[PDB]
Design an enzyme around this catalytic site. Sequence first.
Site, mmCIF file in Angstrom:
data_model
loop_
_atom_site.group_PDB
_atom_site.id
_atom_site.type_symbol
_atom_site.label_atom_id
_atom_site.label_comp_id
_atom_site.label_asym_id
_atom_site.label_seq_id
_atom_site.Cartn_x
_atom_site.Cartn_y
_atom_site.Cartn_z
ATOM 1 N N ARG A 199 0.902 -1.148 0.000
ATOM 2 C CA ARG A 199 0.000 0.000 0.000
ATOM 3 C C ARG A 199 0.936 1.192 0.000
ATOM 4 O O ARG A 199 0.538 2.291 0.341
ATOM 5 C CB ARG A 199 -0.865 0.020 1.267
ATOM 6 C CG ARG A 199 -0.044 0.060 2.557
ATOM 7 C CD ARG A 199 -0.874 -0.220 3.830
ATOM 8 N NE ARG A 199 -1.374 0.980 4.504
ATOM 9 C CZ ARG A 199 -2.430 1.694 4.117
ATOM 10 N NH1 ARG A 199 -3.128 1.342 3.040
ATOM 11 N NH2 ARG A 199 -2.793 2.767 4.812
ATOM 12 N N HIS A 203 10.404 1.085 -4.077
ATOM 13 C CA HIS A 203 11.742 1.511 -4.468
ATOM 14 C C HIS A 203 12.706 0.353 -4.772
ATOM 15 O O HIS A 203 12.347 -0.818 -4.715
ATOM 16 C CB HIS A 203 12.344 2.354 -3.345
ATOM 17 C CG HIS A 203 11.441 3.440 -2.843
ATOM 18 N ND1 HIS A 203 11.164 4.578 -3.572
ATOM 19 C CD2 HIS A 203 10.783 3.579 -1.664
ATOM 20 C CE1 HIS A 203 10.377 5.371 -2.863
ATOM 21 N NE2 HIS A 203 10.133 4.788 -1.702
ATOM 22 N N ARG A 292 7.399 -7.965 7.725
ATOM 23 C CA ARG A 292 7.426 -7.653 9.138
ATOM 24 C C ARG A 292 6.325 -6.591 9.306
ATOM 25 O O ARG A 292 6.203 -5.694 8.479
ATOM 26 C CB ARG A 292 8.832 -7.127 9.505
ATOM 27 C CG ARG A 292 9.950 -8.118 9.129
ATOM 28 C CD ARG A 292 11.320 -7.580 9.421
ATOM 29 N NE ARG A 292 11.395 -7.084 10.793
ATOM 30 C CZ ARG A 292 11.375 -5.795 11.138
ATOM 31 N NH1 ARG A 292 11.288 -4.859 10.195
ATOM 32 N NH2 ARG A 292 11.446 -5.442 12.425
#
Lengths: 573, 573, 191
Positions: A199, A203, A292
């Site tokens: 969301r 990069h 995570r």
Amino acid sequence: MANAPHGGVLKDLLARDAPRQAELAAEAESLPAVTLTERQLCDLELIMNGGFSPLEGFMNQADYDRVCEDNRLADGNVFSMPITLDASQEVIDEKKLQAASRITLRDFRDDRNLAILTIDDIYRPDKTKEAKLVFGGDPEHPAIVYLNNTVKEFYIGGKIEAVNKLNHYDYVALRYTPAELRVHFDKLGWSRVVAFQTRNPMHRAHRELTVRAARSRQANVLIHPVVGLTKPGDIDHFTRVRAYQALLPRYPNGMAVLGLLGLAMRMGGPREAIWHAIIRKNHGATHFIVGRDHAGPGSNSKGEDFYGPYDAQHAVEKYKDELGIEVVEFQMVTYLPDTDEYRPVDQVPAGVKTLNISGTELRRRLRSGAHIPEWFSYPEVVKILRESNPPRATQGFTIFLTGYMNSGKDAIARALQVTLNQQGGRSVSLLLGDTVRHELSSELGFTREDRHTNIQRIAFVATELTRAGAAVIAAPIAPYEESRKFARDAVSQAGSFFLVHVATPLEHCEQSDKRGIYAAARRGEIKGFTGVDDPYETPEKADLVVDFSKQSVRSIVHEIILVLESQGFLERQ
Amino acid sequence: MANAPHGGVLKDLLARDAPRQAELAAEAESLPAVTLTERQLCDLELIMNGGFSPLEGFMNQADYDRVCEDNRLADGNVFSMPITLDASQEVIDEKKLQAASRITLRDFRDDRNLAILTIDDIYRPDKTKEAKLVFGGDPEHPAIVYLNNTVKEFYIGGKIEAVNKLNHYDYVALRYTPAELRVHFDKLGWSRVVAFQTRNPMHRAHRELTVRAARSRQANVLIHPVVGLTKPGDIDHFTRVRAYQALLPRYPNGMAVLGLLGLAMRMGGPREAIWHAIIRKNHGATHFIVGRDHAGPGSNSKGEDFYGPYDAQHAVEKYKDELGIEVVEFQMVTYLPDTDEYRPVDQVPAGVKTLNISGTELRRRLRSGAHIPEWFSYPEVVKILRESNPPRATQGFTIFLTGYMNSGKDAIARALQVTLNQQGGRSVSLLLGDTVRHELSSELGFTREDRHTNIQRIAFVATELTRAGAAVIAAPIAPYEESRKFARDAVSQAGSFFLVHVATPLEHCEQSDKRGIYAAARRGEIKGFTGVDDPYETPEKADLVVDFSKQSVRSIVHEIILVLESQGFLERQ
Amino acid sequence: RVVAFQTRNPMHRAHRELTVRAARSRQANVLIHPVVGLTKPGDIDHFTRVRAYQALLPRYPNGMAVLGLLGLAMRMGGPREAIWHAIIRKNHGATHFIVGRDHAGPGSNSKGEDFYGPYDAQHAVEKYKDELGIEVVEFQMVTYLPDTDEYRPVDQVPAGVKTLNISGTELRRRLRSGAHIPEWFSYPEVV
Ligand SMILES: Nc1ncnc2c1ncn2[C@@H]1O[C@H](COP(=O)(O)OS(=O)(=O)O)[C@@H](OP(=O)(O)O)[C@H]1O
Ligand SMILES: Nc1ncnc2c1ncn2[C@@H]1O[C@H](COP(=O)(O)OS(=O)(=O)O)[C@@H](OP(=O)(O)O)[C@H]1O
């Protein structure tokens, strides 16, 4: 094939009900109609297209209960997220809703009839229970603050019959139903596919991550970003998608497919993660990356994390085998300058280069326009992510003058126009007091209320022009602080606002009046004239104060120009 | 100094009356003021600053007549062009104007007090004699048609006294008085200076005329283009000056100076020329370039050239010696491709390359965007000249939808927004019927008049946004042809307008109405509702006709996109 | 509305300007439908051809066209193939079909006889056009105007502009020799 649907059969209801399309469509016309919220719409879409297979309606009590407590639907299939439709007693009565009632689910955006739901039950769920069992309990959790301030009192279980798929006008090529994606994977001999849920931006690290997974698991990649219902003018959303598209060719030729996924997230961490695994499995992915703090809300008001960095992964692994999908846990790598490569938090010899940019620092930079390391994010991608935080030399702005009638603000305003048309960086819109009165407020009066309305009217037009990148110069009297404050807030939503108080003293204004309006107003020929019979609430935090009695216009225009110059707006050509 | 003034002394009335400014100032606060036209302010500027030496007030009858017949001023000095103030009997009386009367000359642009004219007379000019001998005659001639239609019955002679400079806010660095230019030529050691008169773009052959003309007369160059008073938003004007400024560095370093001359031309051929020669001589030029049809009006109705191609150059040589200033008649050269040079209409061997672009062809091209030969006009200059005729991919535009209430135009409009925000070429402004009613017309009604006002209000806002290059989408009902025609004309002034008739049939609209407005209107709960009790003037030349009963929205939005695409508006990114 | 373009050849600037104009005038999108037979595993010529087409794809207005291969075994049966073609594209959902001069034409026999005339194709597809339910788009291929930097019909050109038009026999000739090819004639990346 790819991965089998969850439950073994894809609940593609739009495909199933296609043959009856016109008849369901006809009847959908007469039935009582419930108009869905954004969350119920995103859900309906995935129910209808088999995204929530084996599920095929909004959850009734036997599904909902065993989901809230056992992470399973009645039939025994894994499913960790409550999918329900809610109403209030008013509407349940108001429309005669009850077991057996057939209703029409309507799209709030365009009023289309999307489905027909044939009711099972109408139970009053224990939300306190749901919040604890499903989202952790914290009264501050997003999905909880929602379950207690929006979700209605009752849930309506019931199987769905698809009549029309939601209409989306943005990126139809990037929107894929689980069937379309499955066909696609199939045409290309694809077998293993790793889906990536996000969301956020995306990069270099994200690019290296997905690629490595694909390569190690000998598989292709599905970049599956999440979007909710599109806001017609939400430019942020278009920027985001363009960012993703821009990143697409930096991926090895042929390895990835970009696909948007209409999901209304709860930010229900672990539980959402499992949900996610299911949705991608239905979408034909064979592998799912779990990160995570996957689908994580973050931390409450007093620094408590709602979940731990690793609970997501612990949840999806617990169910992984049952669900029939492989998890790919990522060990995000860093950057090695000397090397010009990236490597795990361990594959880095002691003393290479801990080159890693912060997210808070990246946002910070994107905002400031402070160059961003090409080793961190590709150029063409960053070039697009910046557009949502444009350079002051591009932003439109409004110069809002205010002061007594005939305080010289009109002349100042006209000169500011010629001056700005000479610097030529933007088109200039002039909204003089009278032009505004003639063009947009010809039938307003001068009561506190009327003047306020007149200013809100200038703000609205000024706000649209500021948004188009224009230089808006407005010269109304704007006697009230309440008004000016309104205009400032209206315009700020689209660009910068400058209040220039043409503080020319009243006496000066009257004496110089060559139209006799102050004279007429003095002798009652005009009611409540500002300065005479009506007040002028002197500005307190004006961006610039000027006196047409003490300074020439070119000097005044120039002070205004100096402010603009000093804030980066005029970086010339 | 350069060449001596005209008559021998510079009529720097401003310099003169300067120690008495405040005095003459306050005296103008009461004297009977008269606001001057543009042709009058432009004559006033060159009077108050010496541009017109020996002349120092508007010509009373003495000066005025000897000029019309002898081409001379009273005192014998050459002066081929009348500089007279005018008025009507109503104003001569109204303020009590007779010889010895002290009037204040006012600037219309800002109501500034400029000069105090102390009358010498108030005669009534033979606008027939004047117009015949002074301007050549022909009932068409621009000056004549101005003389007869705009000039008042009588002229007011009287010398002038300078009270205020006259405020320009554009290109102050390029605005030079004869004093200023004389000081500049003096600081630089400039003796001989060749001036150039133009009212046009100035390309490459010009830079060749001027340089070649100056290097042969061993002089420097004064590029002296003309400008009237500046309309604050006359972008063309800023474009013109910018063109001139870009051309400046194409000159041998330090050879030329760029100066704007606020002169109001009468397009009076041979006679205006001679007038020009004096203006430049007063400005310090030692030389003046006189062209073919200098100040020429071209042709007339039947196609007759008002003047001969050399009536100008030959007219100036008659008085050349007397005036002092020397003439540099130009023999404009062409281009030699093979050569890569330019040469006189004779210095070209038989069969080189008659490469010469047409002016009618250049405008034609500038408009079309059709590439222009760098041998014809420099790049950076043409790059600017085009900005006044931008590329469709840059122009804002308005998509104006119209049709019955609930014809689907609202939904079409919203989807057109999403579609256009995805193509991202411009910002998009949505003016839905209701938003407009709430934000700009909250207190208007539904009478023929009121609806018309409401549309004019949408057109105004739409026209400003179109000008700022936005995509404006408006969805009012717009029941009347008169209204829509108005909006079309308002918006066309700033960009393109498209009328899309959402021709959905009334019955369809009523049947689908889910708000009961047609129901209420049917039973009188709402007066004169369009389609029910008020008419809907069906469009006749709509740019596009659509039916929300027969076509889906994406198909409709796409037809609209196709029109835009086909007219070059969407040339994407 | 979708205009389909049938070809078994390269595709250059003129072809690009042609299809675009049709689309724009008929207010429609474009289907670039090139023909391929069964692929020869090592027939590099075939891969080159397709790449050529793909390379040309972004020179088309964004969003206007779709590139699609069509497995057809042509007979080079001129008029009759042209009608056949109209049918196949109609089945493929096209609403308009361009028909060219010498469409699906064999050329001329050993002793210079053309097997068909430049216009028989168009005469055939028009005869059946209405019955078939598909619109024909007859093209009037334009040339190049250097001074102008534009292209225009065999008539929209004032007397003396620039008859800039490269030959096909000359183009092949050049492609072979490696002799530079006018960017006004065919895009760089394609050539
Ligand atoms: N009661 C009263 N109070 C203030 N001003 C009055 C009033 N009645 C009329 N006018 C004339 O209308 C112009 C002021 O309009 P504004 O739009 O500035 O008013 S406001 O800002 O909404 O308060 C300005 O005239 P213009 O010079 O035509 O603009 C005022 O002289
Ligand atoms: N007499 C009458 N005629 C037409 N429409 C009426 C009338 N009275 C009210 N309304 C409601 O106002 C909206 C229509 O306004 P418009 O601005 O589109 O009409 S117009 O173009 O100014 O004629 C539209 O309501 P919203 O769509 O809620 O804004 C109409 O239902």
